Amino acid sequence: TLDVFTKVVSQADSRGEFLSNEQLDALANVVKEGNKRLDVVNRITSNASAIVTNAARALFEEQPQLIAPGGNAYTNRRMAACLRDMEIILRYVTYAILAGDASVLDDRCLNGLRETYQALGTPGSSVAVGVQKMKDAAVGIANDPNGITKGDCSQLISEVASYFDRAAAAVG
Amino acid sequence: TLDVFTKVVSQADSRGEFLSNEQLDALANVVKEGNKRLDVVNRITSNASAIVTNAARALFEEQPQLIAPGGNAYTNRRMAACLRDMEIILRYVTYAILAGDASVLDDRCLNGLRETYQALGTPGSSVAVGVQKMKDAAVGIANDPNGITKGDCSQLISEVASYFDRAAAAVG
Amino acid sequence: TLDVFTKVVSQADSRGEFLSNEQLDALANVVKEGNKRLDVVNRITSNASAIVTNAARALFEEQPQLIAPGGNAYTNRRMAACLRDMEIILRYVTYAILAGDASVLDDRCLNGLRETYQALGTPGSSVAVGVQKMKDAAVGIANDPNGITKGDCSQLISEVASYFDRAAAAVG
Amino acid sequence: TLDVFTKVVSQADSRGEFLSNEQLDALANVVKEGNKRLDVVNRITSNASAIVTNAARALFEEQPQLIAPGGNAYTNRRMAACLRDMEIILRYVTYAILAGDASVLDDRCLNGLRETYQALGTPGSSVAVGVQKMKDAAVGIANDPNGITKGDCSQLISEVASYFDRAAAAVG
Amino acid sequence: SIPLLEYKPSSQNQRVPGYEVPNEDTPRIYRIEDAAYDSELKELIWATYRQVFSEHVILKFFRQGNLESQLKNRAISVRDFVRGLAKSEAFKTLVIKSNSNYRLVELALKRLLGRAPYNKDEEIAWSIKIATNGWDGFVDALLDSEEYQSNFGENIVPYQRRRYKDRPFNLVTPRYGNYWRDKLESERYIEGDIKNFLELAKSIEIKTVTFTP
Amino acid sequence: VKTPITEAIAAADTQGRFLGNTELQSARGRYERAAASLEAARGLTSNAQRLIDGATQAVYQKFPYTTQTPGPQFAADSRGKSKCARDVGHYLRIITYSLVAGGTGPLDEYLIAGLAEINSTFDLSPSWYVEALKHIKANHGLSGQAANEANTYIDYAINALS
Amino acid sequence: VKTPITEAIAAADTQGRFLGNTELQSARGRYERAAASLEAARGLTSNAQRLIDGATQAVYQKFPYTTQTPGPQFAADSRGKSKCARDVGHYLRIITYSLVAGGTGPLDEYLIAGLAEINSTFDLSPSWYVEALKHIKANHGLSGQAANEANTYIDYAINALS
Amino acid sequence: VKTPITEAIAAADTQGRFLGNTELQSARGRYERAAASLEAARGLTSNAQRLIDGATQAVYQKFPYTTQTPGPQFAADSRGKSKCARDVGHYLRIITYSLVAGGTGPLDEYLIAGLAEINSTFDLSPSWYVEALKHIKANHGLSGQAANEANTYIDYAINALS
Amino acid sequence: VKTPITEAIAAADTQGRFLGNTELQSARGRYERAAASLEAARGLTSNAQRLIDGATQAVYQKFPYTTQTPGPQFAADSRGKSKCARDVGHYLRIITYSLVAGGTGPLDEYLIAGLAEINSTFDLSPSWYVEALKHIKANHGLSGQAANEANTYIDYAINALS
Ligand SMILES: *[C@H](C)[C@H]1/C(=C/c2[nH]c(/C=C3N=C(/C=C4\NC(=O)C(CC)=C4C)C(C)=C\3CCC(=O)O)c(CCC(=O)O)c2C)NC(=O)[C@@H]1C
Ligand SMILES: CCC1=C(C)/C(=C/C2=NC(=C\c3[nH]c(/C=C4\NC(=O)[C@H](C)[C@H]4CC)c(C)c3CCC(=O)O)/C(CCC(=O)O)=C2C)NC1=O
Ligand SMILES: CCC1=C(C)/C(=C/C2=NC(=C\c3[nH]c(/C=C4\NC(=O)[C@H](C)[C@H]4CC)c(C)c3CCC(=O)O)/C(CCC(=O)O)=C2C)NC1=O
Ligand SMILES: CCC1=C(C)/C(=C/C2=NC(=C\c3[nH]c(/C=C4\NC(=O)[C@H](C)[C@H]4CC)c(C)c3CCC(=O)O)/C(CCC(=O)O)=C2C)NC1=O
Ligand SMILES: CCC1=C(C)/C(=C/C2=NC(=C\c3[nH]c(/C=C4\NC(=O)[C@H](C)[C@H]4CC)c(C)c3CCC(=O)O)/C(CCC(=O)O)=C2C)NC1=O
Ligand SMILES: CCC1=C(C)/C(=C/C2=NC(=C\c3[nH]c(/C=C4\NC(=O)[C@H](C)[C@H]4CC)c(C)c3CCC(=O)O)/C(CCC(=O)O)=C2C)NC1=O
Ligand SMILES: CCC1=C(C)/C(=C/C2=NC(=C\c3[nH]c(/C=C4\NC(=O)[C@H](C)[C@H]4CC)c(C)c3CCC(=O)O)/C(CCC(=O)O)=C2C)NC1=O
Ligand SMILES: CCC1=C(C)/C(=C/C2=NC(=C\c3[nH]c(/C=C4\NC(=O)[C@H](C)[C@H]4CC)c(C)c3CCC(=O)O)/C(CCC(=O)O)=C2C)NC1=O
Ligand SMILES: CCC1=C(C)/C(=C/C2=NC(=C\c3[nH]c(/C=C4\NC(=O)[C@H](C)[C@H]4CC)c(C)c3CCC(=O)O)/C(CCC(=O)O)=C2C)NC1=O
Ligand SMILES: CCC1=C(C)/C(=C/C2=NC(=C\c3[nH]c(/C=C4\NC(=O)[C@H](C)[C@H]4CC)c(C)c3CCC(=O)O)/C(CCC(=O)O)=C2C)NC1=O
Ligand SMILES: CCC1=C(C)/C(=C/C2=NC(=C\c3[nH]c(/C=C4\NC(=O)[C@H](C)[C@H]4CC)c(C)c3CCC(=O)O)/C(CCC(=O)O)=C2C)NC1=O
């Protein structure tokens, strides 16, 4: 579990030299964009369950053979395995957005997902679509201004689109 | 956990015959050298903590990159690993000297040390060198006569130098 | 584990009515004195180990029969039981100062201390004296201004002197 | 778990003074009677299973209702519970003979036997009689000289008769 | 909520009865109710550190003062005491930051249950519960398992059940995994490299002019 | 209950150590958040009779069958509608409780624990109270940062219903 | 296996500490005991053919039916009596093993573990080998301290049979 | 490592729930604390040479025997004094690490874990580094709220030494 | 406490079996060791006032600053030197206890348990008592026999200090 701060700490730690002024200035900018980071993380967990069901219907339409019999997500028990585990991507993504680093995302939700499926028979291709259907809706939920002050966070939202693309490409 | 006695017992059990006369003649000699075995083992454990620190300084001088940052023994927790651990070689060596057999040394302190380091990143060669710095001091502690009766134990001290060389060569 | 806030919550839950206006006026004052509460709690844990040893010497002078042989705190082991357990009063006191309520102090460090000593045989009065010794030094550490902004902590300070007096009188 | 030696040690620790000369004179006598203590302890465990069955038949004759249906030791399962147990008195008695102290006997085999029977329904008299039928046979086994050197151990055998009488009277 | 993934069990030294009547190289498996002393409880409190953490990580700072006191008092059952060490955030930083989810199954079976895992498919089976229930909830389901409560019983320190010719588990399994080691080599700080000057080289602006004749 | 003051306390308890600067910074994050949250609670307590009247009528117009279908579970009789204003009158207390406490403690301990457990038994559809809270989410009338903070506890209850 | 040398080793291993004077005094108790035990083993190895002939004939005279009753378990045929001298010839090895090792290790690991387990299956009565060992107990001919040392392991095997 | 951001993360992980407003308020408390803590780290990094020269000379004048007594553990030879500035030069890194991280994580993971474990072995008295840090505590020269922030981690290390 | 008699007892207790010849040989190793040990304890009890006077003066000449430095921890005042002869007078009791008991039991239970725990708090350097015991190791006057057994306990205490 690493931060943006402890990323710089463990990098400066190996050298054995105190952190440079330029590096510190960069971390002072993270303090200024710190309140926008709580704007984006609070907006996802408020719309957490609404974006799980909405990405599930768009997945199970466009691959109909899954809930069809013989499919990997056919019975009501496996179906709940998949439907509820779509939160576990979002659980570890919004950890990484609030952390600002992809270390927590890597060793919990990324380290064995491409591992565990060969023994399970769950298709790799299906996973790529589903998380990639979360990404265009999770970015779109945090994009629109309604009752918040207007700011610019395109340099910060691209981190969120990178986090889902890190989660997608490590499996499929 | 085997002795010199149960070494002969389990060997004589496999042939299924009675214990031969010269085997009892050889074990009667181990009774006569039994009091020399007690003194040597006792001496090591009296100088146990003094030979851990003294072999540690000679190791961490001659490989300075270990306690230097980035090294495997840099931080204190890791450092209290490589230092305290050095007793665990001596814990299982002086077991084997008092046992007179290398069976207790093999299945506890030798059976997975060359195993456990590939997953750990600890350098096997460095550890081997450290044990070889124990050996010339552990032999030298038991060699010198001060306030004990003079005897001859060169046929017994060579067993101790064999035990460290068994512990060293099985790792590096 | 209760707060000042959840004290009002669990009290307003029992009547089953909404939170009244003056209760929110009182809790708004706790927000204003919230930064003084972090002033007092941070000053104790910085001087935690210095006030354990200093209250121990004043205890073991003025009751010399304890570390004298036959005493309850004679041997090195028991002596470490009491010396280190004097932190456990301070561990649960500074919990209660930062909580602002004596509920955490009551069910961990107060609920069985007057219980456990009869079986143990430890003198209740001696422990009580030690607690008193801490109180006049813990108040005196948080009282003096050196390099902090001038402020009135009299209201806050009394609560701390009440917490040690709650811890003292429940045992002796 | 206490000795005769650590009995004197923990008693001399409470007074906090050095070990007196007559205490070392008394413990030197325990060294001289130490070889007779191994004579008596080795004779019981060699006749351990023979004295369990022999004391069982004399118990279950003279109280026939235990064997008879409705009795506490009727079924083959409970019967083994009692039979198996009669070793556990002898297991903790011969510990106490070799220890020379009744501390090991007290906190394992004596501390809850009179406790555990009210919840179990096992009668007190049956247990008391059985222990007392062991005692006159365990003393009689260690008394007779056959192929050992003659000595005097009446001051030592009375300790064994005290140990069974300690085990008997604490239950019934 | 959902019932666990069904796993096939393999053949394992403890799964069956074995007719060893007490062998010497077998552990001294301790009990709380024997003690009656100052003395016995210091050895018993040390062997449970030696099981769940390991000998190397048995340092004083990690140890908890409150938990040790409880055992002497006897307020908490040793089985309730091991819950303190498994849900200790001093323990949690050492093992959960450094180990993946499937290794977290294996390490908890190898230490707390004192058994080797049967197969690979059952570390997958226990894995779903840990992510949802947390680390504490997976430990809580392991200690309240019927298998743990019957064989260790209520007050007996964890140990390895059957090891006729089997590796000690502390030696057998590293505190951390093979994955987290590869990160430590990746962030070693190589000296004299071209890679640490790559983020400086892109900041320098260079203009090049080529002439053709 | 869960409070980011007591969250700092119970975390430092399991490690058995003093309140360092790690747990101390969690306190002032709760403190200055209250000043945007206490008048977020004052906006709900002043408008108490408006919202429970508003959300109850919003449920009937969203689901017109719940006033007509005969059953105890529904609001056909008078004691159903008497139990209607009791239920949404019970929701607004905990939201004002969890705004004042500053955490999701009272929402955990008093509302959502076993909330999916009872609704299977009494066949109360959770989508009834989803539309009830969404009327409160749009008509609570609060403005500014404080209003936004409150907005989360309404959405935290909705995700617990679903 | 169990040996009071290795008993001192395995006890110091679980505590994780060095060989103090507690474990060290257990060694010389084993050492000077061997000098009264090694010629206790020499008294049995020299008289090997006497005792297995003596104990086998002592069993037949004690139990006269075991030579007459037809069955594999009994000694009616020749291969029964061939398996007779094998069994008591196997007992005298372990007694000489456990005398030389100085502990009840080889008696534990090689004889009595599962000894009550097999005799229920093959209906070999353990009272057969009780009278077999009791002939060896009286006919060993050992004298002095050595006899005492060789006498316990015979009695330790008898209590394991019963 | 321990950080009041990750303290909010690891607490919400064991309950298996989303980042509510309980864990979210712990973040801001870390954020606005950094602005009084980052220039608290800039006061130490600019004065790096001064303090390790100051604390090392303060140790020798406090304990005059540590320059004269012959031993590896002491500073009689040159390589002792070379290892002197290495040690206090290693303390000031972690204080600047734990000020920048905002928690006692790097002080836990890199300094005080096993710190009382090694000092028993190498007979390094911890009261040496107590007086070393107390010189840094008085000579830092920091002022205001930021100074207070740099003052706790010095005192948190002292209580870990004792 | 730990005694190689009770070491044989507690080992046979966990297996739930009788005192075989494995545990029995551990007893006579303790018994004939006492002859050397008992005399070895008589050499220390007769010379009680010599050694605590000798070791205390040896500490002051080794560390000359401990008589001059002002502090409770040191021996500047009279009650420090009164607590000086109490401490080394307390060491010689346990060595005579652990020689008479024949094991490291009383050294474990009464001296070294929590000995590294208190010395971090009261800043008592363990190297003070190292030189104190090393004076007793050279000036106890016992040579051979029990003294060798006696000396180990001096060296067992030194390794526990370090
Ligand atoms: C979803 C888009 C696809 C899918 C999901 C699915 N998975 C399973 C079974 C498991 N899923 C996991 C996943 C994880 N475990 C972890 O620890 C983490 C990180 C915290 C993750 C992401 C595991 C271990 C399993 C095994 C069983 C378990 O739940 O504990 C199922 C159920 C399948 C079954 O029961 O056989 C489903 C439905 N499968 C699909 O069909 C989608 C394509
Ligand atoms: C932890 C509790 C908490 C929250 C939630 C919080 C949020 C928060 N977001 C703010 C600002 C802001 N937040 C945003 C966020 C965005 N605007 C967009 O158009 C983007 C789509 C989006 C980012 C993806 C912006 C643009 C501002 C402008 C002011 C600023 O820069 O802070 C501010 C400034 C002060 C104020 O609004 O009163 C607050 C309070 N503060 C808190 O204490
Ligand atoms: C009973 C036989 C036995 C041995 C010997 C053993 C060693 C062993 N050493 C370990 C770690 C370690 N081993 C060392 C030792 C060293 N690293 C260095 O830098 C030095 C070069 C070297 C010492 C000379 C250190 C420092 C650690 C901690 C490393 C870490 O935590 O990542 C680990 C993994 C974590 C642990 O539990 O502490 C094991 C299993 N385990 C066993 O069961
Ligand atoms: C006046 C000087 C003095 C002190 C200070 C003293 C304390 C003291 N506390 C003890 C025990 C103890 N003290 C505690 C206290 C606690 N454990 C917890 O986990 C709780 C949080 C906390 C109470 C709130 C406990 C649990 C014990 C266990 C032993 C007993 O019951 O006494 C003992 C038993 C003997 C020993 O430790 O050697 C001592 C000496 N004795 C003295 O002579
Ligand atoms: C001796 C009696 C006494 C006390 C106790 C005292 C405390 C005290 N702390 C203050 C401020 C403060 N105190 C803190 C302390 C902290 N904030 C955090 O978030 C950190 C975790 C923590 C430090 C670790 C802060 C941040 C302020 C802001 C105002 C200032 O800079 O003084 C002030 C400014 C004036 C006022 O509050 O009215 C007072 C009075 N003054 C007194 O006369
Ligand atoms: C019936 C009452 C009675 C008893 C109990 C008795 C015992 C007894 N055991 C003796 C000797 C002895 N007993 C033992 C026994 C053992 N040493 C070990 O280390 C072994 C573990 C153990 C045997 C298993 C030994 C070794 C001796 C040495 C002297 C001798 O050979 O008799 C002697 C010799 C004379 C004496 O000690 O004064 C006596 C008296 N004599 C009696 O009249
Ligand atoms: C303190 C927080 C809290 C709330 C809010 C709560 C609600 C709650 N409402 C219930 C039933 C009910 N809830 C309602 C309410 C409604 N049904 C309708 O038709 C309308 C659409 C809607 C109101 C707008 C009715 C009519 C019942 C009785 C249904 C039955 O008896 O089957 C029940 C089950 C039975 C009961 O004890 O009365 C619970 C537990 N419980 C709690 O502890
Ligand atoms: C190394 C120590 C050792 C011993 C001693 C040993 C004995 C032993 N004897 C056996 C059978 C037997 N044992 C005997 C011996 C006897 N039956 C009689 O009628 C006579 C009274 C008596 C001989 C005096 C016979 C005849 C069998 C075969 C019985 C059968 O096959 O059912 C069996 C079961 C079958 C087998 O493998 O042959 C064992 C295990 N096993 C061991 O591992
Ligand atoms: C990264 C954090 C870190 C620190 C700070 C650290 C210190 C540290 N200093 C040590 C020794 C030492 N430390 C010192 C330092 C001093 N002694 C003096 O006389 C002066 C008073 C004082 C310096 C001001 C010296 C001279 C040694 C060598 C002592 C010896 O070899 O016995 C040792 C044991 C041997 C070693 O590997 O060199 C450690 C582990 N280790 C760590 O991992
Ligand atoms: C039974 C085993 C046992 C021992 C040995 C023991 C020692 C011991 N010595 C202490 C203090 C002390 N120890 C000393 C001794 C010394 N300081 C010096 O300056 C000299 C270098 C050195 C003597 C050679 C002094 C002077 C004090 C008082 C220090 C103070 O009050 O701060 C203390 C703390 C306060 C006390 O109760 O008096 C303990 C616990 N406690 C035990 O239970
Ligand atoms: C378990 C506790 C224990 C120990 C440690 C022990 C040692 C021990 N070593 C002894 C003898 C001896 N030990 C040695 C050993 C040596 N001489 C050399 O010059 C060699 C370098 C070295 C062997 C490598 C010698 C030569 C003797 C002469 C006496 C004899 O043969 O036993 C003796 C004879 C009796 C006595 O000294 O009083 C004892 C006691 N006895 C015990 O009960």
Numbering used by the authors:
A (entry chain C1), B (entry chain G1), C (entry chain K1), D (entry chain M1): 2 to 173
E (entry chain A1): 2 to 214
F (entry chain J1), G (entry chain F1), H (entry chain B1), I (entry chain L1): 2 to 163
Study authors write:
Phycobilisomes (PBS) are the major light-harvesting machineries for photosynthesis in cyanobacteria and red algae and they have a hierarchical structure of a core and peripheral rods, with both consisting of phycobiliproteins and linker proteins. The basic unit of the PBS is a heterodimer of an α subunit and a β subunit (often called αβ monomer). Three αβ monomers form a ring-shaped trimer, and a hexamer is formed by a face-to-face stacking of two trimers. In general, PBS found in nature is composed of two parts, a central core and peripheral rods that are attached to the core.
For Anabaena 7120 PBS, we modeled 48 APC αβ monomers in the core, 84 PC αβ monomers in the rods, 6 rod linker proteins (LR), 8 rod-core linker proteins (three different LRC), and 8 core linker proteins (ApcC). The dimensions of Anabaena 7120 PBS are ~540 Å in length, ~320 Å in height, and ~210 Å in thickness. But Anabaena 7120 PBS core has two additional half-cylinders (C and C’, one APC hexamer for each), sitting perpendicularly on the shoulders of the two basal core cylinders A and A’, respectively. Among the eight modeled peripheral rods, six of them (Rb/Rb’, Rs1/Rs1’, and Rt/Rt’) consist of two phycocyanin (PC) hexamers and two (Rs2/Rs2’) consist of one PC hexamer. The presence of cylinders C/C’ in the core of the Anabaena 7120 PBS provides additional sites for attachment of more peripheral rods and three types of LRC (two LRC1, two LRC2, and four LRC4) proteins are needed for attaching eight rods to the core. Interestingly, no individual hexamers of Rs2/Rs2’ present physical contact with cylinders C/C’ and the connections are only established via the CTEs of linker LRC1, which interact with both the first layer of Rt1/Rt'1 and the cylinders C/C’. The two shoulder half-cylinders in Anabaena 7120 only contain one ApcC each at layers of C1/C'1. In Anabaena 7120 PBS, the presence of half-cylinders C/C’ in the core pushes rods Rb/Rb’ toward trimers A4/A'4, and energy from Rb could be directly transferred to ApcD in trimer A4 of cylinder A.
